[PDB]
Design an enzyme around this catalytic site. Structure first.
Site, PDB file in Angstrom:
ATOM      1  N   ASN B   4      -9.215  -0.156 -84.836  1.00  0.00           N
ATOM      2  CA  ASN B   4     -10.065   0.133 -83.691  1.00  0.00           C
ATOM      3  C   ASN B   4      -9.195   0.616 -82.528  1.00  0.00           C
ATOM      4  O   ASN B   4      -8.463  -0.178 -81.928  1.00  0.00           O
ATOM      5  CB  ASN B   4     -10.894  -1.097 -83.303  1.00  0.00           C
ATOM      6  CG  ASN B   4     -11.814  -1.560 -84.425  1.00  0.00           C
ATOM      7  OD1 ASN B   4     -12.645  -0.798 -84.918  1.00  0.00           O
ATOM      8  ND2 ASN B   4     -11.666  -2.813 -84.830  1.00  0.00           N
ATOM      9  N   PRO B   5      -9.262   1.928 -82.213  1.00  0.00           N
ATOM     10  CA  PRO B   5      -8.361   2.547 -81.244  1.00  0.00           C
ATOM     11  C   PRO B   5      -8.865   2.481 -79.797  1.00  0.00           C
ATOM     12  O   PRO B   5      -8.898   3.503 -79.104  1.00  0.00           O
ATOM     13  CB  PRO B   5      -8.278   3.998 -81.730  1.00  0.00           C
ATOM     14  CG  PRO B   5      -9.536   4.229 -82.533  1.00  0.00           C
ATOM     15  CD  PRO B   5     -10.218   2.906 -82.764  1.00  0.00           C
ATOM     16  N   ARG B   6      -9.244   1.280 -79.360  1.00  0.00           N
ATOM     17  CA  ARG B   6      -9.770   1.033 -78.010  1.00  0.00           C
ATOM     18  C   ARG B   6      -9.959  -0.464 -77.755  1.00  0.00           C
ATOM     19  O   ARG B   6      -9.557  -1.296 -78.575  1.00  0.00           O
ATOM     20  CB  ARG B   6     -11.094   1.787 -77.776  1.00  0.00           C
ATOM     21  CG  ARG B   6     -12.015   1.933 -78.999  1.00  0.00           C
ATOM     22  CD  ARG B   6     -12.708   0.639 -79.374  1.00  0.00           C
ATOM     23  NE  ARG B   6     -13.656   0.826 -80.467  1.00  0.00           N
ATOM     24  CZ  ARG B   6     -14.496  -0.109 -80.900  1.00  0.00           C
ATOM     25  NH1 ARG B   6     -14.515  -1.309 -80.336  1.00  0.00           N
ATOM     26  NH2 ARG B   6     -15.322   0.158 -81.902  1.00  0.00           N
ATOM     27  N   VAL B   7     -10.562  -0.802 -76.615  1.00  0.00           N
ATOM     28  CA  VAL B   7     -10.983  -2.177 -76.342  1.00  0.00           C
ATOM     29  C   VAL B   7     -12.247  -2.501 -77.118  1.00  0.00           C
ATOM     30  O   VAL B   7     -13.158  -1.676 -77.208  1.00  0.00           O
ATOM     31  CB  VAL B   7     -11.246  -2.454 -74.838  1.00  0.00           C
ATOM     32  CG1 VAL B   7      -9.977  -2.894 -74.145  1.00  0.00           C
ATOM     33  CG2 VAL B   7     -11.880  -1.244 -74.140  1.00  0.00           C
TER      34      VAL B   7
END
Lengths: 94, 96, 96
Positions: B4-7
């Site tokens: 998951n490339p985010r918050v």
């Protein structure tokens, strides 16, 4: 080196970003849709603009070109995508 | 499994045990700031440890009577908590 | 100087850095429970450290531009603020 920030999201995450950015003494910008005319995140930021007055309230948050149009017309030099919209979108970052 | 490339939503839960603010740091990385710098105050790799335990619950409008499906309507009464340990990153439910 | 033989207003500040609920511990001490026991589960002397730093102040009606005299009356508007790391403890402040 960031003067002001835009959040490409809505709801709890947006409010979280505005609070973080205002702590860094950075001006905040929020966007909303037709059905989020009275969502909480609209008010917790310094500047609030309507995106896609013609497009639907679901598609409005996922419109790459129009969100840039708001950021440009407001001197926004940084956009936080949040999560679960254009956060994993490649052409948005480009 | 994946990346998951985010918050994520469940980000808060980690901040409370580590002490470090994730969302804040995100903005600070965008300015070009060093991790262990004077602006983020991030501790070193063996300086970062967990304090106690933490649990998160998302408050949606789902219920086993409609089998976890949302509903439309004005929120007549909103009663919130607060206090020690309880962390509230709210956004959607209020006056009505 | 002296000894305060009870909890203080500022107790909250110490709770956030140690991770210990004083008030809850306080009640369990009256129940005859052990802090190194099942009920309280407090870490031993040297296991306790301070995770970062904390600050407290009280929002009162003492007018600073007028000799700090508590202005009384009826509050028409009130808006609080949550957010990670921010603990609220409301006394008399509500929207009316």
């Amino acid at each position: 080196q960031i003067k002001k920030l835009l959040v490409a999201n809505r709801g709890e995450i947006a409010i979280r970003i505005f609070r973080a950015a205002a702590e860094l003494d950075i001006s905040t910008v929020a966007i909303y849709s037709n059905e989020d005319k009275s969502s909480l995140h609209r008010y917790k930021a310094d500047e609030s603009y309507l995106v896609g007055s013609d497009l639907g309230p679901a598609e409005s948050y996922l419109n790459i070109e129009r969100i840039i149009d708001v950021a440009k017309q407001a001197n926004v030099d940084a956009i936080h995508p949040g999560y679960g919209f254009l956060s994993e979108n490649e052409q948005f970052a480009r | 499994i994946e990346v998951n490339p985010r918050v994520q939503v469940e980000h808060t839960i980690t901040e409370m045990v580590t002490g470090i603010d994730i969302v804040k740091t995100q903005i600070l990385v965008a300015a070009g700031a060093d991790l262990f710098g004077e602006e983020i105050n991030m501790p070193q790799q063996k300086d970062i440890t967990t304090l106690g335990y933490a649990i998160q619950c998302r408050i949606t409008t789902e219920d086993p009577l409609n089998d976890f499906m949302p509903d439309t309507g004005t929120i007549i009464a909103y009663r919130s908590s607060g206090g020690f340990g309880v962390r509230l990153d709210a956004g959607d439910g209020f006056q009505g």
